Curated annotation (Swiss-Prot), chains B, C:
Changing residue 180 to K: Lowers the catalytic efficiency. This is UDP-galactopyranose mutase. Its EC number is 5.4.99.9. GO terms for molecular function: nucleotide binding; UDP-galactopyranose mutase activity. It catalyses: UDP-alpha-D-galactose = UDP-alpha-D-galactofuranose. The UDP-galactopyranose mutase appears to be an appealing adjunct therapeutic target in combination with other drugs against A.fumigatus. Galactofuranose is absent in humans yet is an essential component of bacterial and fungal cell walls and a cell surface virulence factor in protozoan parasites. Thus, inhibition of galactofuranose biosynthesis is a valid strategy for developing new antimicrobials. NADH binds at residues 66, 89, 91, 417, 445, 455. The keyword Flavoprotein applies. It comes from the Eukaryota.
Length: 504, 505, 505, 504
């Protein structure tokens, strides 16, 4: 007899577990509980703040929602018009001293003429090959080259992706990319070159919403707050230390035992394996490759420079900086950094030299968020990475040597990306059915280890669907058919379904 | 205020309506009711019987279940081992005097050598073109010719499909077929010709189940039998005569009114427009094309002939018989026809002549069911179709001139197939969303007018998923993505889900 | 017996006949004679001069020799360095107010950008189809669209060729073009577009030679001058009126009869049929299509304008002028027009009005030559063509309205181009072998009616090779395999061969 | 001054030199002379006979004339209808116990079904690749596999050609083959399979002409006999020992020196370089690959066996015999072997055992001629090759173990085939121009070293055209454009041209 008994136990209150909890709470049928070792809900979608008052999120991939249900929950959580700011999806690729609007291939008119020739030639080759193709690419790398041709592939996607995944593109599968044909739009590319134009893939239609306060972490705090407090257990009192799969009981730090009929686990699956003391799974989960992510934050004194402007996120294929992506985080909300009247001293200049004085001066302020990837194939010196990022900012002309840095931030996330390697699926098809046979739904970024559904909306929906499968027999579409869900409007599932309308 | 009020009203107690009802009954949340103008549930999945005791179903497309949910409901309806018989999926194409195992192209070694050359040459052309193809086929005919080449198309698919659909293949779309690339397996086809091999797509693992009694109609009577009687209204008492979609009320023939919050309608959508008195929808629904089906049944005296053997269904591309498909219905269950000891006089010989006497002789008996299609592009003379079918049986060597016929059956089903025309989707996108905007889920073979989800398992699930959409916010996967549901094991939805397991605690 | 007998009789003293004469004279074996109705040798390669002293040739296709034999004869005829001028092969296409260097597709960077997009889009389509092509184009038009794509084909080659041939491109064969594959060089075109580059297909090693004096006519007068005069019959005394192919005799205007063993006829083959009184050949030769060519010459007062500069020939696809090609004939030689000190009055201004002064004034002078085509499919107004040409010169900005015209020239050549129609070969494989069996070698621009071997170097060698076939059993390579002769260095046949060398010792 | 002076000197009296001399004699203009070290004209187209009375030619490639001129000289040399026998071009490939009619691929219905499947499958692959091909094959091997597909290539053309050329197919060029596209006729091949049909490429109009007497050797003796005897020097008196390219003189073995203005040399070009004492040319010519050919003749007692019948020549891809080609030489003329009444003892039985008696018995007789190739890459044991050939005859069921052999013949021709290696052209376009610059027309099988024009008709015409080039400025079409001459009817040049008609 365990100390607590519930039908459905949810481990983890990141977006995945919150998704499961939200759906359980709406269904209000089977009994349930959600636990997490952190007092603040949000998991890795939480937001940090420096002593100087600069917020930083864990990533630069803004929200794009594929589901009405996700929208319902975000809207319930933060219902006021002024709870959000809307922006156009503005991004550029840093290449040869130029900010090239995304998508790269549609904007190579900014490159020197001879390089345009090399690019067009390679894409001509790719189009002619795609005309008689009778096989599908097998690696991320083959997919890139079939889409872009050699010249364009070498300038951006190949070196960029190495910096993103910390593995070569030849080591990765390409199913996670979706099912689009690996072929160039040669006319679109020659057309912009001939017309000598540039054009980003953004406009009034292509927008994202960012929360006015508390970063992305603020979304998840407000979602979590809609849950019945008594069904949550957050903090040390909720840290799971053992999972006894055969007896269907969990044991917490404080010794509390919880019995369950079904388990939704959102912890990394390698940690779950260890927690189950299941040696066969420990071996299998150790085969799952992943990269570690360093997030660097830099707060800068001054009004937003013209050269930065309305830029949102930026891609860096080149080797003159260690980060793959930068975000102008101060463009997302005026509350991601201190107000202009707030007074801070300069810590250092961008060229690394001491400020003229140590006196606190006022703002306004702007803020940059940088991402760097580490793996066995790509080491990162944690002792120098901050300074290398800052020099990277100078090298890319994001900061003048004279810019005044008033805040710095560095954090290393051991589990950063679950890598879409060639071996991933072969390993996961061994791991997930074994857990499934024990009534354990292991789901989430590292819960199910599939990158393509490991961001916020998809993960939230992994949790939702896991519960919908457990209770209503729904297909888990997002877990197993990401292309299917991505290719459509998912409007059927709502925070208020027929069931609740008829019950009231 | 109306006489009766329910959250969800279902019109029709064919497989689709019964599906909706089963799901509503399992969930047992929103109130609901199911009405049908017929006293006997099962809709067009019902079974007829001749005065002589021969059973006939409405078609020859046997059950293949794509869903565990469907299996749960059939098994619950008919749980005994002896409620079913299992048969291998044995089918052949009648061609130039031969029974050619299906699939046709893998078995052309049975044809004359010169015909094999023509077939292979055609498939070589199609392979060569498929190698540089940069577009998808737009019509059923283009699909057929790309898969099979001209020689093979002309012998089977083309003339056969005209006979099935009662429209030319050039008039049909090809999305309903699934997503498989239209290209020939040249190597497999030439390999079998070279080896002189024949090979049916059946075996110990390719089987179907058929109910021991009452034909397919017996399945749906038993499924309906599991519902609570007081939530059903079957017979003249349940005939819908008016649908007021703005009031969300329905009026029955006896004057009863039913208010609903959501309507699952499984009547033919063209009949729904009329019942709604919605002239806009009438206009649109009249643009939908359909064929009418004649089912002919023939009871024969004798032990099962050797030439017939274990054959299940048979295809007829050639123009020496009016039917496109025949079924040896007596092979499906010994209770589809009378016992050997039953005495029946001979009605006629297969060559059409009278028999000498009126003497009632004994069996055993075997039984053939034939299907013929009719449309405005292919009329059928109802007055001679029976005699034409019988002569077709003689032409195809299924019956000898002297075989003794002891029972005949003929019925015309006006809405037979909803035709997958080139125009169908354009029209449905104007119709179904307009109905949806009124909280009307029009679903079924003719409720939603998509052939590819219009047989028993799919239709049943259309009903189940419609309810799941209404109540649980489920995706209607079968309605909009038949290729998705047909390509996977649909095991998630069960007659007993977690919701029920947990609630009984 | 006839008045004169020779082994080989040659009719015509144009390039083709003179070629036959030259080879016969070099071999100096069989006896021979060459006749022509013009006292001045050179046939249609002759040069006219206006009363004001401007020379005009018959066309603007400059010499490119494919044969050392041809070079030998021109050099023997005009041996001095000062008998010739050398020029780079400079040409442009007039398009949308601009002079675009030939070849057109390599220079579209000159057109507006939105137009370059259409051109490249079209060539992209053509490159993609060329990748999977398994047929050869059947028509000039098909060949054009496969090489260039629709956009580019529409800007230059289609409308230009209609103006040149006076029949639609869809009505012509494409073998005469050579054997190069009809596919676009997409990379070269896009590369130039991207680099913003223009590039003409000329330079220090892409040049032509033009005679210093007397135009091309001067070459042929001088080549003829090397023949033994007693074997020539030029003038009214050499006009053939009758050919009796059965007797192998010819009758001249003055009643003189010439008997031959082998006849090399370079007159137009349709006229030959008539002279033969051969009704079957008359019928066959009338199936051959040809266009008529108008040559217009314009003499202009002024030093050569900068806008003209070193231009040699110029192409005009557009509608604003009736000519297809123009030639700055004064760039070819200072002796193609009068010296600066020559005094001539202005006949008219280029805008058509009368000049202010009737007074003779001095030069310098420059000179334009224009070509206009006409046929039954593309009629031309003969009465207005001169004025229309001059207005065309104003329309294309070659002349200013105020330019002073001091000389004009206009001549119509009835047989201008023998047209490479789809029908040409079928006809010629009846005509040529039929004459062949009479021992008549009918050769030349209209002798054998194949355009692609109808210019000076090729026609000359047609004559030479005919003789070499008659005497030495040589292959007639030029007549039957123009791609073969055009793709190689023809260095073997010389004005002094081993035969002459070994005999002189 | 030299002992003799002529305008054109021709060295060698094989088909190539006789062609040259024939054209010179027709033109009867410039003075000329033809020398050869052999008293009997005909070069390697000469014919040996065994002591027992069996004739053997040097090869089994029958005459197909591409020129009227050649026909004229053959007709003049041997004008009687009874000077020739005509026969259908009947050939077969020995494969897995069967005689398969040529062409092999239209006749694979004779092979086991499983093997038919593998063949058709490989040809399907080939047809599908040829549908999208945009390059030309670079090697003989690539050409074969693209025409036939893998299965068929491996059964016949690949192994057969190794035995022919004595070098692998991968090491040879493919321009010598002609300009036909490398693609399968898939429908013809599958059609004959489906119908169970066999069809050879012969019939009443696909015939060849063979000399009634003396073998091919009699053709050339007779041709030579039409030349003015005083213009020939054949035998020891005509052996060239030195060629002084610079003074244009030739020195013979007997000491006599001959001056020339133009030289037509038809000796092997590697010997010409040696005779010229030109070490630059020696070096180049030693880079030319060639194989050595062994010809084996077998004379057999008995009427022609039914199993042989009307077979003319036969191909042998398999390794149960050393020869690549066999010829039923007794089928070509009843005078290639002794009359039936001639008496000969049996020398051995086909299985290698002695005859029961050494008594001489009568015939009739039939005769087989075999070809074996030798090179650095494929050694032949000169001392056992004869016996191995005879065993090969038993292995291929051409002879029964009991067949009585009454005559044997074996001869090694050191210069057999000039091999169409990949390097050939690179080497030849250095060698011939240099000789041309010295007014030397080196022409012929080994004079110019191009196999594709090294048989009788082509070689003869090389000699004719060389003279026509020297005298009349003719193009040497056969030497430089063999596809051109092979694709047409060459009717223009005749033994009586206009120049001779008019000279009368």
């Amino acid at each position: 007899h365990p100390d607590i008994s519930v039908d459905v136990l949810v481990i983890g209150a990141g977006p995945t577990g919150l998704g499961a909890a939200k759906r359980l709470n709406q269904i209000d049928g089977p009994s349930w509980m959600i636990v997490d070792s952190n007092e603040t809900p949000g998991g890795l979608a939480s937001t940090d703040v420096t002593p100087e008052g600069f917020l930083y999120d864990v990533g630069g991939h803004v929200i794009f929602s594929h589901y009405k249900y996700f929208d319902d929950c975000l809207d319930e959580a933060l219902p006021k018009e002024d709870d959000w700011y809307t922006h156009q999806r503005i991004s550029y690729v840093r290449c040869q001293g130029q900010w090239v609007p995304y998508p790269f291939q549609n904007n190579i008119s900014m490159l020197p003429k001879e390089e345009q020739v090399k690019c067009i030639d390679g894409m001509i080759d790719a189009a002619l090959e795609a005309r008689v193709a009778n096989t599908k690419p097998k690696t991320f790398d083959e997919w890139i080259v079939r889409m872009m041709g050699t010249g364009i592939a070498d300038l951006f996607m190949r070196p960029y992706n190495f910096k993103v995944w910390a593995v070569p593109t030849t080591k990765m599968q390409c199913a996670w990319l979706g099912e689009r044909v690996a072929a160039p739009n040669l006319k679109a590319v020659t057309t912009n070159v001939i017309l000598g134009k540039t054009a980003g893939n953004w406009g009034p239609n292509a927008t994202f919403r960012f929360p006015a306060r508390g970063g992305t972490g603020g979304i998840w705090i407000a979602v979590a707050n809609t849950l019945p407090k008594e069904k949550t257990r957050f903090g040390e009192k909720g840290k799971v230390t053992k999972v006894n799969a055969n007896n269907k009981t969990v044991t917490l730090q404080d010794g509390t035992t919880i019995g369950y009929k079904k388990l939704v686990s959102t912890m990394a699956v390698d940690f779950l394996a260890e927690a189950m003391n299941d040696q066969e799974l420990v071996g299998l989960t150790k085969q799952l490759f992943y990269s570690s992510t360093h997030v660097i934050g830099v707060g800068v004194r001054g009004s937003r420079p013209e050269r930065i402007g309305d830029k949102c996120w930026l891609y860096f294929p080149e080797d003159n900086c260690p980060f793959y992506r930068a975000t102008i985080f101060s463009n997302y909300s005026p509350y991601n950094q201190p107000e202009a009247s707030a007074a801070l001293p300069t810590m250092q200049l961008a060229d690394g030299s001491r400020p003229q004085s140590t006196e606190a001066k006022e703002g306004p302020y702007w803020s940059i968020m940088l991402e760097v990837s580490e793996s066995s194939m790509k080491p990162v010196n944690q002792e120098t990475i901050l300074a290398d990022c800052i020099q990277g900012l100078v090298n890319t002309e994001m900061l003048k040597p004279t810019d005044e840095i008033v805040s710095t931030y560095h954090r290393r996330f051991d589990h950063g990306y679950p890598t879409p390697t060639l071996e991933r699926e072969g390993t996961l098809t061994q791991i997930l059915p074994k857990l499934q046979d024990k009534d354990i739904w292991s789901r989430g970024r590292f819960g199910s280890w599939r990158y393509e559904v490991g961001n916020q909306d998809h993960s939230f929906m992994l949790g939702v669907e896991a519960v919908d499968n457990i209770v209503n027999g729904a297909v888990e579409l997002t877990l197993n058919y990401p292309d299917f869900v991505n290719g459509r409007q998912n409007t059927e599932r709502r925070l208020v379904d027929g069931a609740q309308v008829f019950a009231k």
